[PDB]
């Protein structure tokens, strides 16, 4: 049997998608819920086309997709010394750019679009807030400039951001209660 006809195309890693819903009755970690995991091309699209778009999510909810074994928390061993490539979005970009940016974010991860430094990526997070939405790509170490910079430069080009726009990178240790890199 020739394999192309009947086998799902496997991804290089198995990913886990998380959902967060703000509820003051529970603690923050208690509001984190793992939705599903996948490791094939077909199983990702089956899950993506089955969940609501982040534009359609209630303000205060988050989507998170991380490599299996890494949890969307800075306390995780692969996140204590890392950081995020942060993209800030205004209220009008919710309609125009939020959904296409998040899908491109997902594709750059499951597609390992960052060459050798794709191992340094931990996951991605999109937060839907009323004051403005955020999309971030998390990395495992903030002190590897060659790794963090190349990821930010490839990320900015894949989103189509013009050189007039500038994105920053913040360490989890600094951000948890400025920009370490700029591209």
Author numbering: 29 to 205, 212 to 217
Task: Give excerpts from the publication.
Crystal structures were refined using diffraction data to the resolution of 2.2 Å for 1a, 2.67 Å for 1c, and 2.66 Å for 1h. Finally, the electron density for the complex with the 4-chlorobenzyl dinucleotide (1h) indicated that the Trp102 could adapt two conformations—the one similar to that in the complex with m7GpppG, with the nitrogen atom directed towards the cap binding site, and the second flipped by 180° with the nitrogen atom directed towards the solution (similar to that observed for 1c). In the case of the benzyl modified cap 1a, for which the benzyl ring was directed upwards, most of the structural water molecules were conserved in the cavity, while for 3-MeBn7GpppG and 4-Cl-Bn7GpppG the benzyl rings were directed downwards into the cavity, and the structural water molecules were replaced by 3-methylbenzyl rings or 4-chlorobenzyl substituents. In the eIF4E complex with 1h one structural water molecule was conserved, which together with the hydroxyl group of Ser92 appeared to form polar contacts with the chlorine atom. For the eIF4E complex with 4-Cl-Bn7GpppG (1h), in which 4-chlorobenzyl appeared to be stabilized via polar contacts in the cavity, the phosphate chain could adopt two conformations, wherein one imitated the phosphate chain of m7GpppG, while in the Bn7GpppG (1a) and 3-MeBn7GpppG (1c) complexes, γ and β phosphates were shifted out of the pocket by 2–3 Å (distances measured between corresponding phosphorus atoms). The guanosine of 4-Cl-Bn7GpppG was not visible in the crystal structure, while the guanosines of Bn7GpppG and 3-MeBn7GpppG were stabilized by interactions with amino acids from the loop comprised of residues 50–59. Single halogen substitutions at the para position (1g, 1h, 1i) did not disrupt and even slightly stabilized the complex, whereas double substitutions (1j, 1k) destabilized the complex, probably due to steric hindrance.
